[PDB]
Amino acid sequence: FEHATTVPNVPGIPYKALVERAGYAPLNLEITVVSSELTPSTNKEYVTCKFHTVVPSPQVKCCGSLECKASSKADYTCRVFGGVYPFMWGGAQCFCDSENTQLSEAYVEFAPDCTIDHAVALKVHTAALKVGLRIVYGNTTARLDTFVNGVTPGSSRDLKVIAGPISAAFSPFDHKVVIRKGLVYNYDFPEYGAMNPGAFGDIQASSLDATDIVARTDIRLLKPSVKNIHVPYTQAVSGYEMWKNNSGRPLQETAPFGCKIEVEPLRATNCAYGHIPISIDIPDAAFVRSSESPTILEVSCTVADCIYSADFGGSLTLQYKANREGHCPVHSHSTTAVLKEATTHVTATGSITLHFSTSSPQANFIVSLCGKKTTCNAECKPPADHIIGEPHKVDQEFQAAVSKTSWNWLLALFGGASSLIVVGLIVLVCSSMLINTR
Amino acid sequence: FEHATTVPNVPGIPYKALVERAGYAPLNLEITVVSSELTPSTNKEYVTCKFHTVVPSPQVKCCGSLECKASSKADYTCRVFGGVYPFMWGGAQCFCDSENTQLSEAYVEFAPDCTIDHAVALKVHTAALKVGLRIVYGNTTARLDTFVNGVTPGSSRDLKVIAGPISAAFSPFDHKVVIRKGLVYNYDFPEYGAMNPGAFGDIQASSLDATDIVARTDIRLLKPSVKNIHVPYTQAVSGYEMWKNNSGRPLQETAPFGCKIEVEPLRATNCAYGHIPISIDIPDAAFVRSSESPTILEVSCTVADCIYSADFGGSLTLQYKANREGHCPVHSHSTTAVLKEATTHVTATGSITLHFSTSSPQANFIVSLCGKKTTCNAECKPPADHIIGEPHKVDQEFQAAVSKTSWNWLLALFGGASSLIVVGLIVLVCSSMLINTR
Ligand SMILES: *[C@@H]1O[C@H](CO)[C@@H](O)[C@H](O)[C@H]1NC(C)=O
Ligand SMILES: *[C@@H]1O[C@H](CO)[C@@H](O)[C@H](O)[C@H]1NC(C)=O
After folding, report:
1. Closest residue by CA, ligand 2 atom 9
2. Would you say the C-alpha torsion B316, B322, B326, B327 has a positive or negative sign?
3. Which of A341, A404, B7, B181 is packed most tightly, with the most Cβ within 10 A?
4. B124 and B173 Cβ atoms separated by less than 8 Å
5. Phi and psi dihedrals of B424, rounded to 5?
6. Cβ < 6 Å from ligand 1: which residues?
7. Which of B44, B149, B157, B202 to mutate to test the interface with A (most CBs of A within 10 A)?
8. H or E element, residue A369
C-alpha cells in the first residue's frame, strides 16, 4: 500500500500513524528521526598560519658594486647600500670608503609547526541534508538513511520511501568560513592573492606544503647599523595571531537549533528545524485482514487522572468487550494529544490503562482502538515543576489551550442587541405608517 | 597619479586613453585584453561508464536445500530453485527429483575500459573571472593578470590596478554538467544514490576505482532452462550508451560569445561580453613635464579621404607648427571614432597622415595633438565589401549614424504653427474687445 505524511524535524521523537483499509486492520506505523546530517558543498581556497621570515647571509662586494635583483619568493625584497665597513671577530673583513657595497634580501615561508597549527579558508554553498530514520510497521523494523531531496529514495529492504523537500532551509554556515584545529569560525576572509599587512590571511598557499606561496606584510629593509654586520629588518605582526586573539567565539556555541558540527565532513548533525513530507510504500503482506484481527464491543473511555505536563503525564483507562483474542493498535485521531504505547494484549471483556501527553490542558478528543473509536473529555492541570529539558511540545500549540469555561463565558458575553435594533426599526416603521393614518 | 576608466569585454582590442595634468604632457595609455579566463567553482558528484555484469559459478546443492542470502555488491541479487537436473559433458552431475536445489546470484562492476571511457557528473556554481591585460604607458609595457573582483589587484611591477566588478554576469555553465573525454555536456543528472534502469547514471562511484559502488538496472533472474546448467539473466541496457547516442551536441558549439572551453580547469577562455571598470595608479616618474614636451602652433585638420568601414579605413591629415622637437601623443576625444597610432616624430612645421576608424559615416569630432586640439568634419561612405570577421564595431553605435543632411531636413520640417495659433488667439481677443466697443 501507499501513504504520505508530514513530520517535523526533530530527533528521537516517535510519531505514531495509521493506514486505513477496509477489510484490513489499520496498521500502526512508528516513525523516528534517529539522527540528522546536513552536509553542504565545500571548496578549498587557501591555507594560512604563522610565518617565519628569512634573513639569508648577505651579499657583500668588497670594493665593487652590486644591484637589486628579482626573485619569485613570497614577499621577496632586496636593497643595497655602499660605503660600508663591516667588522667581525677576526677584525674588519674589508673596507673601501665608497667601493664597498652591501646587498640584503628578505622573504618568508610557513613555519615548521604550521603543519599542525594551520587554518584554512573555505567557500561553502548549497546546503544538503542527509537523514537517518527508523520505521516500524507491524513489528517490522527498518533502519534507513536518505537525502531529503524528493528524487532519491534511500534503500532499506528495497523499500523506496521518498521525503522532502525541506519546508524551510536553515544554514548556520556563511558562504565563507575558516577551519582550525577542529573548530569552525564564521568569517569573511579575503580573496586568494588579496592580502593586507597585519590582517588575517597575510600568507596563502594552495597546499600546506605547496612550493608556491604569496603574501604581503610591509617588509621594508633598514640601513646597516654601526660597524657590525647584520640585517636590520622590519615587518608587521602576523594576522594569524591577531585574529586568534580576536577571532570571536566558535560557531559551536552560536548555531541555532543546537547544531552539532564536525570538521572533516564540514557538516552539522542533530540540528532540528522545519517539517518534511514523506511518501511510504508498504507491502500488502504486512497488512492483516480484518476478520483475522479481533473485534471489539461497547468500549468506554474513562480518565483516571491527567495533569497537563511535558512527559507522558496524562493517564487514561479503557473498558472493552471483544469476541476474539490477539492484538490491536491504538491511536489519538486528535493531534493535540499523543499516546505513548502502540498496542497491547486484548481480552473478551478486559480493561487497560494508557499513557499519553498533550499540548493543551483540555483533554477533549477521540481515540481509536482496533477499528472502532470512542470519545474522551476531561480537564488536566498545569504541573508544579516548570523546567525540564526532556522531550516536550511533541505537538505544537493550536490556540486550543482556551478552556471550555472560557468559551462558555465568551459565548454568553457577546451581545446581540442588533436584533433588538432591527425589531425597533420594524416597530418604528409600523408606528410611522399608523401615524400616517392620522 | 591615479585614474579610472571602463572598458568593454573583448580580446585583442587596444584602447587608447589620456591622463591630463597641468604642467605635464598627457601620457597615452594603451590597454589590451590579451585573454580572458572564466573559472567557476566545481564539485565532483560521481562517475559513470559502461558496466559489465557478473555471473559467478552457481551454488548447487546436490539433494539438499539452500537459501537467498544478502551481500553489499551493487545490484546484488539472488534466487533459488529446486528439483533441477543439471547436466555436463561427463554426464549428469546430480539428480534428485525434489532435493536438488540451485542458487544463482548476480551483480555488476565498471568495465575495465571504463578507466578511459568514464564520464563524470559535476556540480558547478559561482562563476569567477580571471583576465590577462597588457598595459603600455609612455613606452612602458606591463603584462598583468588579475581577477575582476574589486578587491584584489594583480601584481605586475608591484603596480596595483583594480578592476570590476563585471557589468553583467554571463555563464554558459548550468549548475549541473557532465564531462567525458575532454568534452563538456550541459545536462541535469540525477542525485547520488538516485538511479533509474535504462537511464543515464545508472552506476555511480565516488572514484573511478572506488570499491564502493551502487546501481539499479532492473536485474531479475530467470528460471533454469532445459537440462543444461547455466544462468539465464535479464537486465536493461546501459544508460551510458543510450545517452551517448542522444547526448546532444557539445556545449563547445552552443555557448554564446564564442567561448573556448577546456576541461581540466573546467573553464572558459576568450569569451567576451559586458564592461569592466578599472582603477589605475601610475608613478609620477613616468610623467613628463610639459616644458620638456614640445609645443605646437596653428595646427590644421585636413581629411584626405575616408570611407566608412570596419578596419582603419578612415584617413586624416594634419599640418602643424612647432617650436621644439620630440614626440607627442594623439587622441580622439570623441568616442565615435578611434585612431590607430599613438604618437609620431614631430617637426617645426611638418605634417603627418593618420589612420582611424569610426562607428558612423559622419566624421565630425575633435582630435588632440600634444595638449592642443583641432576639429575635423567630413563625410565617409559605406564600403562595398560587407562581410569580414576581423575586429569591427570597436565602438558601439550611439544613434549618431544620422547624417547632417537628415538633421537639416528634420529641423526645417517640424512645424511651428502653434505660434500662428497664439497670434490668432491674441488678435481674436483684441477684435473681441473692439466688437465689445460696439
Ligand atoms: C508481528 O505481529 C504478528 C501479528 O500481529 C505476528 O504474527 C508476528 O509473529 C509478529 N512478528 C514479530 C517479529 O513479532
Ligand atoms: C620612452 O620615451 C621617452 C621620451 O618620451 C624616452 O626618453 C625613453 O627613452 C623612451 N623609452 C623607451 C624604452 O623607448
Report:
1. B139
2. negative
3. B7
4. yes
5. -60, -40
6. A 138-139, 327
7. B149
8. strand A365-369
Q: What residue's CA is closest to ligand 1, atom 13?
A: A139
Experimental method: cryo-EM
* B152 vs A123, A149, A193: nearest CB: A193
CA of B71 to the centre of ligand 1 (A): 26
Q: Can you read off the three cell numbers belonging to residue B114? A: 571504463
The neighbouring-strand residues paired with B328 are B344
What is the Cα Rg of chain A in Å? 39
SS3 letters for chain B? CEEEEEEECCCCCCEEEEEEECCEEEEEEEEEEEEEEEEEEEEEEEEECCEEEECCCCEEECCCCCCCCCCCCCCCEEEEEECCCCEECCEECCCCCCCCEEEEEEEEEECCCHHHHCEEEEEEEEEEEEEEEEEEECCCEEEEEEECCCCCCECCCCCCEEECCCCCCCCCCCCEEEEECCEEEECCCCCCCCCCCCCCCCEECCCCCCCCCEECCCCCCCCCCCCCCCCCCCCCCCHHHHHHHCCCCCHHHCCHHHCEEECCCCEEECCCCCEEEEEEECCCCCCCECCCCCCEEEEEEEEEEEECCCCCCEEEEEEEEECCCCEEEEEECCCCEEECCCEEECCCCCEEEEEEEECCCECCEEEEECCEEEEECCECECCCCCCCCCCCCCCCCCCCCCCHHHHHHHHHHCCCHHHHHHHHHHHHHHHHHHHHHC
CA of B79 to the centre of ligand 1 (A): 25
Dihedral Cα B320, B324, B330, B334, nearest 10 deg: -60
Angstrom distance (rounded) from CA A386 to CA B375: 89
Question: Which ligand is nearest to the Cα of residue A136, counting in written order?
Answer: 1
User: What is the C-alpha separation between A318 and A352, in angstroms, rounded?
Assistant: 5
For A69, which DSSP code?
A: -
Q: How far apart are CA A32 and CA B48, in angstroms?
A: 34
Under a CB-based contact definition with an 8 Å cutoff, are residues A219 and A202 in contact? no
CA distance A403 to chain B (A): 50
* Closest ligand by atom to B288 CA: 2
Cell of A71: 626573485
Task: Say how far apart CA B405 and CA B382 lie, in whole Å.
Answer: 16
Looking up cell 555488491, which residue turns up? B73
Length of chain A as a residue count? 438
CB A128 within 8 A of CB A267: no
Among A137, A139, A140, name the best residue to mutate to test ligand 1's pocket (greatest count of ligand atoms within 8 A of Cβ): A139
Residue where the block lists cell 565498471:
B110
User: Which positions in chain B have a beta carbon within 8 angstroms of at least one beta carbon in chain A?
Assistant: 41-43, 123, 125-126, 146-147, 149, 151-155, 190-194
B189, B196 Cβ separation under 8 angstroms: no
Beta B214-215 vs B203-204: how paired, if at all? antiparallel
Q: What is the resolution of this structure in A?
A: 4.3
Distance B142 CA to ligand 2 centre (A): 15
Helix, strand, coil shares of chain A as percentages rounded to 5?
10, 40, 50
Residues in chain A within 8 Å Cβ distance of B194: 149, 151-153
> Strand pairing partners for B372?
B369
Q: By the 8 A CB rule, do B336 and B398 touch? A: yes
CA A356 – CA A339 distance, rounded (Å): 4
Nearest CA to ligand 2 atom 12: B139
Q: What is the dihedral sign for C-alpha B107, B112, B117, B118?
A: positive
DSSP symbol at A405: H
C-alpha to C-alpha distance for B21 and B287, rounded to whole angstroms: 9
For residue B165, the chain A residues in CB contact (below 8 A) are none
Q: Which residues of B60-88 are buried (b: 16+ CB within 10 A; e: fewer)?
A: bbeeeeeeeeeeebbbebbebeeebebee
- Of the listed ligands, the closest to the CA of B345 is 2
